[PDB]
Amino acid sequence: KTVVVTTILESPYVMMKKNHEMLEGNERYEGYCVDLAAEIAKHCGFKYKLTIVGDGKYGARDADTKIWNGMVGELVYGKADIAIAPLTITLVREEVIDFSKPFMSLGISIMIKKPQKSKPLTVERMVSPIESAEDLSKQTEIAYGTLDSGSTKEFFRRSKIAVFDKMWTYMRSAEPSVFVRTTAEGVARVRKSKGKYAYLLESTMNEYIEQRKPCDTMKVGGNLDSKGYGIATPKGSSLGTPVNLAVLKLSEQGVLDKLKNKWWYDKGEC
Amino acid sequence: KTVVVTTILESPYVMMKKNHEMLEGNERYEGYCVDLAAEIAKHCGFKYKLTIVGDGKYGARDADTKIWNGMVGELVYGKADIAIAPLTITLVREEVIDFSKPFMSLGISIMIKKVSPIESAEDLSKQTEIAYGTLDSGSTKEFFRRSKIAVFDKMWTYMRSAEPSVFVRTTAEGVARVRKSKGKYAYLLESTMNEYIEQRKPCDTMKVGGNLDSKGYGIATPKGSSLGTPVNLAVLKLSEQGVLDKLKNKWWYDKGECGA
Amino acid sequence: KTVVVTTILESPYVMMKKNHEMLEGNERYEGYCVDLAAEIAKHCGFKYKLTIVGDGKYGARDADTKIWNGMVGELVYGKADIAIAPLTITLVREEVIDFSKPFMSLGISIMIKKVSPIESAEDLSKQTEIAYGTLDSGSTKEFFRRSKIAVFDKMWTYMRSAEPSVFVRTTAEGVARVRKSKGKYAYLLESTMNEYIEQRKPCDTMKVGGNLDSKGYGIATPKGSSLGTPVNLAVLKLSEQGVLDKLKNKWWYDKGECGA
Amino acid sequence: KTVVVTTILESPYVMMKKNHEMLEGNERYEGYCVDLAAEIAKHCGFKYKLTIVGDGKYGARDADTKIWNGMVGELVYGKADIAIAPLTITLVREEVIDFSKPFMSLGISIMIKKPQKSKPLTVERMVSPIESAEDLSKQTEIAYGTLDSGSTKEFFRRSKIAVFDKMWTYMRSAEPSVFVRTTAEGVARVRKSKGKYAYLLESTMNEYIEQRKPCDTMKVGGNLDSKGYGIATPKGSSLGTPVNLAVLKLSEQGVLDKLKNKWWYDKGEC
Ligand SMILES: NS(=O)(=O)c1cc2c(cc1Cl)N[C@H]([C@H]1C[C@H]3C=C[C@@H]1C3)NS2(=O)=O
Ligand SMILES: NS(=O)(=O)c1cc2c(cc1Cl)N[C@H]([C@H]1C[C@H]3C=C[C@@H]1C3)NS2(=O)=O
Numbered sequence A, D: 001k002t003v004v005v006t007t008i009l010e011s012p013y014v015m016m017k018k019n020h021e022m023l024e025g026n027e028r029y030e031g032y033c034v035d036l037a038a039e040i041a042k043h044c045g046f047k048y049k050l051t052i053v054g055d056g057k058y059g060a061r062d063a064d065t066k067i068w069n070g071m072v073g074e075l076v077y078g079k080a081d082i083a084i085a086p087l088t089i090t091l092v093r094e095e096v097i098d099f100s101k102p103f104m105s106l107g108i109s110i111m112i113k114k115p116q117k118s119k120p121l122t123v124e125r126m127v128s129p130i131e132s133a134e135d136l137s138k139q140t141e142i143a144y145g146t147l148d149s150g151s152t153k154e155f156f157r158r159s160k161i162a163v164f165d166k167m168w169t170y171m172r173s174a175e176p177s178v179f180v181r182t183t184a185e186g187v188a189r190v191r192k193s194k195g196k197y198a199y200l201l202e203s204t205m206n207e208y209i210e211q212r213k214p215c216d217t218m219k220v221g222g223n224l225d226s227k228g229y230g231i232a233t234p235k236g237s238s239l240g241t242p243v244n245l246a247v248l249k250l251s252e253q254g255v256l257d258k259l260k261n262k263w264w265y266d267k268g269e270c
Numbered sequence B, C: 001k002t003v004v005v006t007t008i009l010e011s012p013y014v015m016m017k018k019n020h021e022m023l024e025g026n027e028r029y030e031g032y033c034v035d036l037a038a039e040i041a042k043h044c045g046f047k048y049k050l051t052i053v054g055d056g057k058y059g060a061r062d063a064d065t066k067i068w069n070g071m072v073g074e075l076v077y078g079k080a081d082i083a084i085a086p087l088t089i090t091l092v093r094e095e096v097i098d099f100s101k102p103f104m105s106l107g108i109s110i111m112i113k114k115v116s117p118i119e120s121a122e123d124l125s126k127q128t129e130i131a132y133g134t135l136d137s138g139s140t141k142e143f144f145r146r147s148k149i150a151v152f153d154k155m156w157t158y159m160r161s162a163e164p165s166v167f168v169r170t171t172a173e174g175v176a177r178v179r180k181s182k183g184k185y186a187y188l189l190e191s192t193m194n195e196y197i198e199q200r201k202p203c204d205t206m207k208v209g210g211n212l213d214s215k216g217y218g219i220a221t222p223k224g225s226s227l228g229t230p231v232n233l234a235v236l237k238l239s240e241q242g243v244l245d246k247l248k249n250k251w252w253y254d255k256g257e258c259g260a
């Protein structure tokens, strides 16, 4: 029996190959997550089929409707067996699905358009109007937002820290809406907003986008928190312990480090 | 029913208080792990008693004996109910005990005395002038022993065949040996311990290069115990509430007895 | 019995003089390989005739047909008696023809137009901005095809799946493509050819990095022929007498039509 | 049946391990040649034993008696089957034994004691009294010699080049004898002669000795010629073709390059 591996289209985790029109099956996709699935299969023998989540969402719970959407919803309602995707381990998600040990460490970072070089002996220096989350919250000329139906938005919603609470209070009543539907949409907003929009995304995606052309964006400050990506399985499933053991084996063998190096830094430019 | 909490004396995780002679119970202990244990107990809602492991070892399996020692042995053999200590999450340990989600990130680092010719670990393995060792009965030693990476294979080949014994009994003794080696001995240890040592007086040791790999400390529970899910949710809630970051800042950088 | 010698038009190995239209026989050819063939004939004591291979290919076997072309094909199928030419000694060729001892050392080198950002082979593979190719039906292409090293595997994967065809038909064609690419294309060729090109006008190309590997040119002879031992002894005698070094200096640095 | 592999005690080709007193068999020795023999065995399956030539000589054709000695001699007379050792491919040797493709390139170089750095804005410069071979031949205040019963001595003996002929003419009638019995003896002579002795050895050994402590010797100029080391085998033997094919396989596979890098440059003490 073949199990369903749900995932989301997000570079560099899951990207379509250039010649993907003539290919079929799992060979159309490429990235970190497809290699992770291949290594998981190598550890524990099973047949898997790569599928993309229908709504293109990571997962969230509506307050009034109380139905999980995205990959978490797909896993909860039995439409998938395992989610090998950049899914953030959160307390609310852990109560409805099973998470393995983290395979990648990350944190919430800020993305802004890279400032032009300041000419004024004849040294060149780069100065950005945002240096930390606190000054980003204090100012009001640059709008900021997160990804809709994501872990960062829920983190800001349920944060009792004064700075993060202030940012959330600004976000919930910002006209026009500062929330985006996709990471690429947020990066496009940052690029075309001429320095008047800051995107709050994970540090891994931020660094990856900064490492590729045209590299007109930069990451400012440090990470707002420390989290991780976990492989998710439904509650009471027989694939949880083998997946956790496989992740631990890959971590000890150094496969994860080599995968990160070959998918993030060996493919950068500029 | 009071829950026995095994732990090890390792700064800044667990320390003996200055007036611990005139104190009883858990009130004679201080550190990151003490506050973490207090918050875990508050979240779960149980009474706990802090106990120090009889042998100052984290845990390992002896060859041709298959007997666990340290806090891992204290857990597999029913002598303890939970282990709130800087216990590295490893593949070998996870097959006998239940680990929660990591609460602190870390990695293997190199500590030398205060140009830094050694720099990275590859250059350290490329030079026989400087000796390097690890802590015995620890995750770093097992990581080096089982490593299939070529560089780490050469490092393990050196350590296993070296006279005198390049391994050390305790982390404090290892950093002392580094201090008194006049730049001839290098210590391999956890990144958090290295940072804590290098931020303290006399600040005669420094950390060179990045982390060799990345692991985490987890709260360990006996396999099949009923405390695994509650402590896992407690760790997740503490991480999302910013408590773990504030505790690390309090016990690593708030004091800062050095100029940096 | 006149011995048919097959060779390829490559500089400075074989050239068609300047007034070849008014010359017949071997007198219309010049170069390192012509002098080497003259020395080999003088040592062994046989009359020889220089012929140019019909197709300007060094030699390879095509998949699903198992037919050799070029000088290797000229030797395996009995069309030639000996091959004095810059023929790289390779494992696949050695199983079908007899190679003598190498008479010239060489290696695979990278060249671009006139500090180079490309630097070594690893950085060249990493930077997708610059395209790199290889001569068709040569030993470099087969070296990259059969290579199991990861970096060379990436290079070969790029070359096979490249649009337009990153390969070239002749060495001069690749030289011209590098010259007219304005620093966008890099050529992968032999070290000796690279040095000869870079030491000639207009001196717009330079060799970067070191040598990817180390190989040698050998005098090829049909398998199980009576000429193998005499030509091997002749090559050894020429090497010990310093004739090969003298010829290389004459044809590589004596002229030197460049600013260096 | 197990064949006999004859070797020479030369570093870093064949070296004894520190704990070689309690070891037996092929595990006693270490170096480049033992790994070469192991790879040859892996390519073509056979059982081999490592022996050291009795007289400790590479091989030379003794005049008058016309009897070969050393590794070449013991290969000719049947007491050895294959010589995996730094044996130079020469015309005289090729006529009595078989030689494979060269597995390592080399040349004749000059070894002199490293001079002290010159005191003279405040830059420090290194100046040596010998820069090439012809100036070494011209002067007479510095003695120089080669290895007895070696390939370099034979090369100088039959060389018709004017400068090499002049060096040979000086060498044959030099008292006390400038020739040494072992490479280590010549290096000791260079070190203890306080700049009044130059040792002519192969470039590989010269570089290896340069890279190790106390590194008080240096190589001046360039190689006098271009040669190579071959895997010798008796004339009309069945092991010549498999040995040649294995050498080609190792060269194309990159094994030889990594072996040479690990033995010569990885263990650099200076
Ligand atoms: N450098 S990285 O982000 O690619 C990365 C991050 C991590 C890795 C491995 C790598 Cl390569 N393994 C750890 C795992 C190992 C054991 C301890 C924590 C989990 C279980 N999680 S992690 O700390 O999130
Ligand atoms: N900054 S730190 O080292 O004290 C640190 C490190 C980590 C924290 C929290 C903190 Cl404060 N939480 C994560 C946990 C949270 C959820 C996602 C990964 C695990 C489960 N583990 S971690 O990445 O090892």
Ligand SMILES: NS(=O)(=O)c1cc2c(cc1Cl)N[C@H]([C@H]1C[C@H]3C=C[C@@H]1C3)NS2(=O)=O
Pocket: C101, C102, C103, C104, C105, C106, C216, C217, C236, C239, C243, C244, C245, C246, C248, D088, D089, D090, D102, D105, D226, D227, D228, D229
């Ligand atoms: N200096 S050079 O490249 O023209 C050159 C290169 C080489 C020469 C001679 C010269 Cl002049 N001879 C050797 C041969 C001689 C004997 C030892 C190795 C082979 C057999 N091959 S080589 O190392 O490929």
Ligand SMILES: NS(=O)(=O)c1cc2c(cc1Cl)N[C@H]([C@H]1C[C@H]3C=C[C@@H]1C3)NS2(=O)=O
Pocket: C089, C090, C102, C105, C214, C215, C216, C217, D101, D102, D103, D104, D105, D106, D228, D229, D248, D251, D256, D257, D258, D260
């Ligand atoms: N760089 S090195 O001296 O260790 C070295 C030197 C040589 C190598 C391989 C290496 Cl790694 N292979 C060549 C061989 C390969 C094929 C072409 C010439 C011989 C047959 N001989 S070589 O040119 O003498």
Ligand SMILES: N[C@@H](CCC(=O)O)C(=O)O
Pocket: A058, A059, A086, A087, A088, A147, A149, A150, A151, A152, A153, A200, A201, A202
């Ligand atoms: N990785 C997040 C989504 C990305 C983001 O919110 O920035 C998740 O799994 O929910």
Ligand SMILES: N[C@@H](CCC(=O)O)C(=O)O
Pocket: B058, B059, B086, B087, B088, B134, B135, B137, B138, B139, B140, B141, B188, B189, B190
């Ligand atoms: N904290 C580690 C020990 C430190 C070390 O490996 O030196 C463990 O629990 O195994």
Ligand SMILES: N[C@@H](CCC(=O)O)C(=O)O
Pocket: C058, C059, C086, C087, C088, C134, C135, C137, C138, C139, C140, C141, C188, C189, C190
């Ligand atoms: N001279 C080489 C061809 C050069 C190349 O590989 O580009 C040969 O004989 O195969």
Ligand SMILES: N[C@@H](CCC(=O)O)C(=O)O
Pocket: D058, D059, D086, D087, D088, D147, D149, D150, D151, D152, D153, D200, D201, D202
């Ligand atoms: N390699 C040489 C010996 C060393 C030398 O003469 O310098 C030989 O095989 O004879």
